Subunit: 389 residues, 4 copies
Amino acid sequence: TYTLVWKVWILAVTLYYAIRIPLTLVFPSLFSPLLPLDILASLALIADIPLDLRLPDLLAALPLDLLVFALHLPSPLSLLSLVRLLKLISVQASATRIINPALLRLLSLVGFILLAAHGIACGWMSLQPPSENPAGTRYLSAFYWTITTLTTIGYGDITPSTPTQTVYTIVIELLGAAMYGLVIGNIASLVSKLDAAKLLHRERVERVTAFLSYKRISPELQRRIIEYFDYLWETRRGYEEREVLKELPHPLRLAVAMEIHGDVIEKVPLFKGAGEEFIRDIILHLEPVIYGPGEYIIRAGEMGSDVYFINRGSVEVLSADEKTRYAILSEGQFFGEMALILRAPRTATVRARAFCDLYRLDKETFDRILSRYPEIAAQIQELAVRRKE
Amino acid sequence: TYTLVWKVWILAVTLYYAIRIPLTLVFPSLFSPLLPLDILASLALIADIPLDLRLPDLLAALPLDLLVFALHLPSPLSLLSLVRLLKLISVQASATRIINPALLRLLSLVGFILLAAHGIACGWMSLQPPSENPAGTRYLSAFYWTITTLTTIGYGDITPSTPTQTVYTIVIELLGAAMYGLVIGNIASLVSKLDAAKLLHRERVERVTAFLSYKRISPELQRRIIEYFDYLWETRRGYEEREVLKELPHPLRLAVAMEIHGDVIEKVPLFKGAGEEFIRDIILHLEPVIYGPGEYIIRAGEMGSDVYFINRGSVEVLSADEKTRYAILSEGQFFGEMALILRAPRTATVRARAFCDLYRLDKETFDRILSRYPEIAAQIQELAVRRKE
Amino acid sequence: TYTLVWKVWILAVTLYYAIRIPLTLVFPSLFSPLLPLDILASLALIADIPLDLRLPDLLAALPLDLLVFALHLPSPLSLLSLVRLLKLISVQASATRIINPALLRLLSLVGFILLAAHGIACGWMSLQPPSENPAGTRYLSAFYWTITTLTTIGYGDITPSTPTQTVYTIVIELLGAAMYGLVIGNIASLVSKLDAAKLLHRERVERVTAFLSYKRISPELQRRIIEYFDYLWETRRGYEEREVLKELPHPLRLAVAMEIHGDVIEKVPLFKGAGEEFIRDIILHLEPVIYGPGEYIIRAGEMGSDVYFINRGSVEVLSADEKTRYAILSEGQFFGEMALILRAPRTATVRARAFCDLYRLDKETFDRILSRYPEIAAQIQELAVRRKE
Amino acid sequence: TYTLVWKVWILAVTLYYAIRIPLTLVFPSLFSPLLPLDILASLALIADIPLDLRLPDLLAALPLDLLVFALHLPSPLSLLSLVRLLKLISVQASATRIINPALLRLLSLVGFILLAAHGIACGWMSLQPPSENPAGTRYLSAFYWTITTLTTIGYGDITPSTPTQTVYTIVIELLGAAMYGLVIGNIASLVSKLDAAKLLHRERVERVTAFLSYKRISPELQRRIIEYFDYLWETRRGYEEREVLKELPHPLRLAVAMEIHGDVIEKVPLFKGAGEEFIRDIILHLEPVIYGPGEYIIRAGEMGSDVYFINRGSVEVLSADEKTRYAILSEGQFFGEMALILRAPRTATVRARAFCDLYRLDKETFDRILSRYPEIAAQIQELAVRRKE
Ligand SMILES: Nc1ncnc2c1ncn2[C@@H]1O[C@@H]2COP(=O)(O)O[C@H]2[C@H]1O
Ligand SMILES: Nc1ncnc2c1ncn2[C@@H]1O[C@@H]2COP(=O)(O)O[C@H]2[C@H]1O
Ligand SMILES: Nc1ncnc2c1ncn2[C@@H]1O[C@@H]2COP(=O)(O)O[C@H]2[C@H]1O
Ligand SMILES: Nc1ncnc2c1ncn2[C@@H]1O[C@@H]2COP(=O)(O)O[C@H]2[C@H]1O
């Protein structure tokens, strides 16, 4: 598309105006050689209102410039040529519609302050006696004074000497030295929001760890609490899927979930090739859970019935005691299905070989699934009746 | 009413005192020509206590001024004429009872600091040797010094030279340079609360978008999540009606709801002209929901029964498959009524042609409505039995 | 008690040390006339460890002073007499155990900074060439420089001139100019917590009012929403009783409730003189609710049964229509009792004459009360059977 | 282990580089005697990439130094030797993996600013005319100027005099005087998080106390609310066990609970020596509760059945009236067991002699325990039948 190119070009034109117009207000020797480079940017300003896809555009586009300097209008009225700076109040919002915004906003404030400093320096250069000095060093001194005043440092090596300069510096010391604190506060607060996810996984971890270390916790447990937390930050960046997705409506949430959980989908044998309405009914009820190594899930005799679907990692099935391990299950399989099918207590124990994450599904949705969909229930039936040895 | 006029006049009088009294304390040549303009404001100060609809008013109204300058009381005791400044401590609270308060408060703090600066400058002008200089430039220099000190810039071009001036500037450098930081912090924090609604629709959108862009989401879904969010900001400003209205009591909430949801009311045929107690029983249970274009609502076979009332936009009804579209529904109509009436599963599918918002009503309130109100149930009965083709 | 007197005396002694010890470190001409006033404060320092009802006390109490100046120990080692300042690190915490703490903390930080400024000024006075000047003006100049540096104003009229002074001022410009910002930030944040209740009733009111004024709400409703809110702030200061009292345990909550709701207690005829276990069972289930004038409570035909106990204000009972008003009820009475007793729908309508607040009690606790306590049920029975006309 | 030693050594080497490299950039007379101390640190830099258990390490380890000064490369290109400072951007994160982090982070920011100040001072020393002055005082003056500028104090005693110096000081006054505010804000905010637990027990206590003191609460109740709160802070530091432990998964939560509640375990006679599956089923359902002295728990006639296990303190059993105290129970015992066993109302009253904390267990888990485990039910049966006198 070319809308990005046009927006970048408009930004370039409105920065050209911002840098140029006060500087040519101070020095009238310009605008004679820079004339050909101004008509193009002026006709590229009235051609932006038709490209709607608004009062700033109406006021700023009309060529109020190029005549103020033409008729050589005197000084108390020549300040009305400054209205071509009103594109910024819209550009700062239109540039947002393109990169993390917490980054685009951070930069826009920085340019703004470097434009305000230039404008104030050009203002201070004007109301001075005519001194036979080069223009470049005069601008350097004016900008040095403006940065000294705005930062509330105040060296005092160069200070006002006339009542007009005194009033001007009072106005600056109030206004600019207030917005510098304001903009620096905003930027300082918004730098701390570049991370967002790192901060919460750290606040949560510190909150848990302070309480754990306050008590006389053995080193072993304290080893695992910090390993799980690191695993969660690595694989999920501290995000909470549920907590994010209860802001969206139901169809958008379903569409997002069917792509987010698309890894466990087409992995287990019994989901793919089993219709498209079952896969929509069951996708929202799959919830993630993490079990670390050397940790138990089923303890062979408990109530409840919660099928567990292996996403990543290997799970090991054991008896009610340590003896006679049956087998080992891997990625894309599941276990714990006959607790509700046969109406019997748990008949085996399961551990985790490594950091394996897996999806747990409740009993109510599961027995509703059995009561509604016959052939999937039959497949579970034959798998359970075969799994008897 | 004239209470606004009287309050504005009292504000004008208490600003006249604030600007004048220290300035006439410094210069005793005044108060001779300004006498006729003082008696009116003094008699407009004792006439405010009777207009109650209070200790500041009691202390400040009594003409302690106009005698201090009369008897020409000496300097160490003449400072007791400053008590006419105690109207501000009430005026700053009484002006609130009139425009967003987050705007009225922002301005009141700005005037306060420009009054404190003037008072401090008038103070610094006093304890100086008598210099043969014009009064205007002397006030300008004093105000320049006060603004330099309060802003913590400190050029140092004009500095104290006597022990009394040194003690005065120590007092200012502590006290005023503390409240300047305090007031600027308050104003900086309260500028960010002018928006309120824009901020939350932006924090929520960034929170969702960061997680969406962290994953490998296709561009299509990412297109719709941001279109819905923009539609919600345009039509609701990011507000949450439920979340706002669970602070009010039940009768106030009902009265607010019957005006807020008054658009869907008198629009559908079966609500207006159907009593006034049904319309009170059902107004609180209507909840809004948004469905975007190309999105499904009913999938022809599901459980549940939730009638959907069309507020704005057109909804299209389809079969269990793509073939044989029945008809199209428009603004002010509804669908999905016979799921509970006939005790049958959903017999049709519905999509959205554009961004249509609609109101969903639960099954419990609906069957209670059927069990309580006979004639509305009969109207639904005849509409359902006619809608069989 | 005398513990307050002893604590105030200890504060006076530890402020005497704080003001005196660096000042006598700078000027060795003292400590000769001030000797009798030091032994008393020194023996009032070793007598505080026995009054336990602790390392700061152990280190600071031992008379390390009074010998440093005695043997006239040289300068590089005389700084070890400063350890008598270590009582402050405990006093700042012990003074809390006495007035809103948000006020006591605000003042303690202010004294701390005025002690740090004095200590730094006394430090700067020392490493100077011997100048034949009065001591008072020298201290004034040193304190002026210290306040200029700590506030980050920096006039620059008096500046370091020796390498030792340069190192000292670098140390101050880092350390003191950091804690001044720190302490001022703390004080600025904690000034805004003096109110606490005013802020929340204002944030809530603005949050509701912004949404109400965004919509096209009639002036009448907007009149009542703001009157109720003002009534709630006047009678409850914006507090939420429930929200406060679910931090306490059950017995403390019961003890607090039996005193808070003691106004409605011994007011209605049927509670006082009706045992002490019923009054404990029912005190926690009474909840407050506010109904404004011209507002309805019962609409004659609804389901539910919620007895309403009149706390303050008059309530008016009406028929199902406007005609034939029955009577008027006043403070200390109740209504709406036979909805559950006779198993009949509501037979009357009730309005509010003015801003009357009243207590609502649910149906489950009420019918449990009827099922458990016989004589109160009999009293309700006879009152209901008499109230048939 | 030796990984801590290696990490400390790497920190020492990267601080040696940070202090040395700009200082030898300014003064070329060095690097001749300091050569033997550089080769060791350079070969201790390429030996860190193999010890992985990464682009900063790749760029910084290659000996780009030691040749820039060798060939005596000119000034506009000699600045490329600064790349050996890129270890800090990793070291600041790797030092975290070792002491409360809220302390390690506080210190890392302080070193960073003292390194930035040194770098800026060394920069300012360079672009100066050659003055016949000692190097030490020149560095002292440069560092004094850098600290004056970064702190936004600005004495102005020494100021730039050349255009290059003016551009340099503009760059510093923007950049360094922005990050000084940023880092000081971060450190000021993070100092207030060293406590964490103290703050919440204080915010909660103030929130409760403001409401209690707003009402006309008697002094007696106000005495106990503050004693319980102090007891809770002493024995639990204001922590909420439940609220912390609903962030961990179920097996980690169980493992943590079986160590946290290990005090009440092996204390009561009937838990230890009663299997290992009962002790896992019941450990998560024990919840703590605190009852102060002179407070009632059971009032002899109520419904419900909640066994109470004595952790610490003595509990006293009384009749339905004051007469005929039966006995006294101590640490490690329990009461209130026959409310569900005999299906009878409460037959006794119990008070608290002192601040005794105890564990309450609900009725559903208790009757499930009775229905599942026979021998523990039999032990409760025989204890209840013996406890009949
Ligand atoms: N021999 C086996 N081979 C494969 N899977 C098994 C075997 N024995 C038990 N399982 C699985 O392990 C599960 C443990 O709990 P369930 O009894 O609910 O259901 C069990 C089966 O899913
Ligand atoms: N031919 C039709 N004309 C109008 N509305 C229909 C038609 N067919 C179905 N509907 C509506 O579409 C709804 C789809 O779900 P229900 O079966 O619950 O109820 C259905 C009717 O409200
Ligand atoms: N004539 C009356 N005198 C006093 N109270 C009444 C009278 N009529 C109705 N009430 C009360 O008003 C209540 C309205 O609702 P209820 O019918 O639940 O119970 C009613 C009584 O408590
Ligand atoms: N004489 C006694 N000796 C020991 N314990 C008792 C005695 N009488 C009552 N209790 C205990 O006190 C409890 C009070 O409530 P319960 O009746 O539920 O169960 C009671 C017993 O656990």
